[PDB]
Design a protein around this nucleic acid. Structure first.
Lengths: 83, 98, 97, 8, 110, 110, 97, 83, 96, 8
DNA sequence: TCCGATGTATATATCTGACACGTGCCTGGAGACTAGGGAGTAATCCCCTTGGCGGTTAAAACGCGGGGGACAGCGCGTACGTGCGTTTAAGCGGTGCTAGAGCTGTCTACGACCAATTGAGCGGCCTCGGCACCGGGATTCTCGATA
DNA sequence: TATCGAGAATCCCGGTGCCGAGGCCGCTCAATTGGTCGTAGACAGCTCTAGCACCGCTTAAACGCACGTACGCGCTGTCCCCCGCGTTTTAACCGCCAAGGGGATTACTCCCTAGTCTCCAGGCACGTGTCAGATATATACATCCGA
């Protein structure tokens, strides 16, 4: 039933590509776990608020608008998904 | 045989990924991470496909911008290599880290 | 003629102080900060409840919008304890008719 | 009845 | 004859003013309509959050051997609690000062 | 008898919809009342700010040898302009990417 | 049955595009971003105009609250040029009314 | 009456006391000019908005409420002066 | 004669100023700086006394918090001395 | 009509 | 460790001014009641989300070799902290003026509201031009080797 | 300290294909016209707060300078850990079929809130007395740093 351990599917080469878009030339091997921990904290904060909007609407489906409102409330406004 | 020097292909990769706009995380792995995180807030949640894409676009923008600030913290410490302490400084000065 | 009414939370902040610490007093500077804190948290909660009503196509801010705004705005155990107190108050008020 | 504080 | 008036604050079991909160919700342009339970719930939350800060600030006053809460005690209360510090992270308290905190590398070697 | 309708948008000299902006101001819980000049001024500002982004993004499209504005061109338009970058500093543009930017110390010696 | 009418700024964004770059087109994702931008700037300006009316004990949002909200919200020369266009529009409208 | 060059009245020992409250043990002599430039930019941003609130009210006096609103809209809410 | 070693009185001063809550800038010099900055936005503004005090409390809180982030940037670079490049890093990472 | 853009 | 010089914490006694309290009255909260439309509910359509299947091939994982960057240890000189005597001007209290914040009281122009009318804007249709890609050739950055 | 030139790389071109942008059309709902009524707020007039200006005194604080030491930072040497890249394995991605949960309506009804009118007591401004605590003066006790 439940999912587990999917943060390890955020691969070393994916984290390297994100760091390359961030202009990073050289990466310590300890960065990949630090980045996974940071990403899980960021997603937990956005998804908790998005699911709070979904529950207030009495819906079972998290919409792109629930995500856009959760991001706006946290001061990270996203254009291109509505709102 | 032919071989590029350390950091030459890194600079080529920086130029490639700063020219491009596509999402850099694999979509199915990221979607499973979103569903795993969501199950702790309530069970049996569905997602609009565009909700997962909104979460991925926001997450990659956040990580890329944090890598820029991390890279400045490395360069300030006279290094070209980013380390966990550079992420920790960037997040503390941003007011994300206590 | 005497000066116009300036409305304040100070007497209710003082009633709450006398409950948590009956022998403790408060300075007027600290009372001014408490009044600013109450006004700020009111405006945050009412503003998020306002957004929640608008997003859902609703004309009314209810106890349910306030509860979701409190869950969004307050961190961690402050939310759980604030939601407990808000629900207890509306339950007591409803029973009193 | 008293307040349900996090401390009490 | 009409029955003797009693406050909605007293019907709720609250110190904070339910009627004033209701009038602030109606006049503050938050929505077209305000539900009867909305000001009771909001008054209870403002009262609870007041009680959380004041309990910690009266503890800070007592630890500093003072019987009066001053802006310093509100700052010590807020910054020594991780959740009130998260709630008030963008807030400055006038005459609050800062937490006593020296970075470990700066302390003299012994 | 009754005269033919003229849009408040064309009466103001605007492309942006003054009647829709007025109805959004009245229904948005911004104040009790909305003045007749308020939606005209606001529609003009939204139109002007649209024209500023679209000018820079149409130039970004042309510099990229494209005829169609894509999210990339809006991102280049915004981040290469210091004032639109300040206005949109907390905003993510979906599918926009980043500015080409390498720290000088990372480039090889000459 | 046909779907219910979802309004957007897309036709007016396209009218402004046809004025500033007559031969340039726009993708639907870029149009969606432009619609989000217009909604976001409307909500910021109307929200600051709303605070300005309340702070001054006023019931009405007027052209004057919109002008001050624009001066607070827009950086540098964006404010000066937006205020020029807002004042030009209101003076043409009140001449033609 | 008129005023000029008052940023020099933000003295080296005042900037040192602020740095000491910030936990700073040792200060380079270049810091005092950098701190003055930073303070002038901070005050220009708050006072421009405060004066914008003052002019909107048609007042000639900047109130503590004009300052508190200017600080609040810049994400720097101040308690203890009203609001 | 008696001397304390370099940084001993600095640590004593950190302890003193982190204990206290008083404004650390001189009030009359700060008030003249506020009036000078204001005259570029409008001529002959008055200030409430409490408006100047609100500006000073916000300004000192802002500078103190920036010195904390600057001190972390110095320590990250293996220094105990703050420098302009530490203020520049702190303000860049904050997004100021 | 003309726009008073920062570019003109 | 251990002494002198210095600094902080702790005690007691003064006195002062801010807090907590009590009093009167008035304005805004509550009691009682009505009209009407928001939203709770039931019923229904059909969107779009979830799930599963097979092929393919892009991408991840792995292992290896080696070079260049992290970081420790060292030297050295300069720029900062400490402490002193001198100079500056802040802070205090005090007097005094008057700009202008704040409030009262009268009007009237403006906006909310309603009812009728009609064209601006939406969803649905559909078609052909811009862009994505193939796949090859021209050209240019890298870097071991030549001189 | 610049020059070959084999190699991998990016840019660039002409051709192929498709599928998304943007015009066209018909319906409808929301914007406009025209008109009424009520009160927000513009204006005039007045009170008296509190902000600005200046004086003179005291002394806290800023300034300027001398000294010396501990820190910044350039150098050099080691070695490890990261990059580049060739090979193998994984599973993402795509195109497709299929079911049905649940989002998104639509109609119907009633109970909830806005609005009105009339009290009447909770909360405010004001005026008051006294004890919490800011301070001077004293000195017990802890720390620092040369010996």
């Amino acid at each position: 039933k439940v999912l587990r351990d999917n943060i390890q599917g955020i691969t070393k080469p994916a984290i390297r590509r994100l760091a390359r878009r961030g202009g990073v030339k050289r990466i310590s091997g300890l960065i990949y776990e630090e980045t996974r921990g940071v990403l899980k904290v960021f997603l937990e904060n956005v998804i908790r608020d998005a699911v709070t909007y979904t529950e207030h609407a009495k819906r079972k489906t998290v919409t792109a608008m629930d995500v856009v409102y959760a991001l706006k409330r946290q001061g990270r406004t996203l254009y291109g998904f509505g709102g | 045989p032919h071989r590029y020097r350390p950091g030459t292909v890194a600079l080529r990769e920086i130029r490639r990924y700063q020219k491009s706009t596509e999402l850099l995380i694999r979509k199915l792995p990221f979607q499973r991470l979103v569903r795993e995180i969501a199950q702790d807030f309530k069970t049996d949640l569905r997602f609009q496909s565009s909700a997962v894409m909104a979460l991925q676009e926001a997450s990659e923008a956040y990580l890329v911008a944090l890598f820029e600030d991390t890279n400045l913290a490395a360069i300030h410490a006279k290094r070209v290599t980013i380390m966990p302490k550079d992420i920790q400084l960037a997040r503390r000065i941003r007011g994300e880290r206590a | 003629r005497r000066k116009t009414r300036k409305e304040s939370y100070a007497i209710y902040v003082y009633k709450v102080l006398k409950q948590v610490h009956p022998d403790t007093g408060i300075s007027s500077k600290a009372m001014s900060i408490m009044n600013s804190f109450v006004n700020d948290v009111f405006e945050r909660i009412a503003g998020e409840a306002s957004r929640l009503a608008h997003y859902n196509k609703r004309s009314t801010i209810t106890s349910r919008e306030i509860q979701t705004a409190v869950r969004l705005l307050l961190p961690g155990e402050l939310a759980k304890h604030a939601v407990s107190e808000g629900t207890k108050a509306v339950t007591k008020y409803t029973s009193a008719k | 009845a008293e307040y349900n504080l996090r401390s009490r | 004859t009409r029955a003797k008036a009693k406050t909605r604050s007293s019907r709720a079991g609250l110190q904070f003013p339910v009627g004033r909160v209701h009038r602030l919700l109606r006049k503050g342009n938050y929505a077209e309509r305000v539900g009867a339970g909305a000001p009771v719930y909001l008054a209870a939350v403002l009262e609870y959050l007041t009680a959380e800060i004041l309990e910690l600030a009266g503890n800070a006053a007592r630890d500093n051997k003072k019987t009066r809460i001053i802006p310093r005690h509100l700052q010590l209360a807020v910054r020594n609690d991780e959740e009130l510090n998260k709630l008030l992270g963008r807030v400055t308290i006038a005459q609050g000062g800062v937490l006593p905190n020296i970075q470990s590398v700066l302390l003299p070697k012994k």
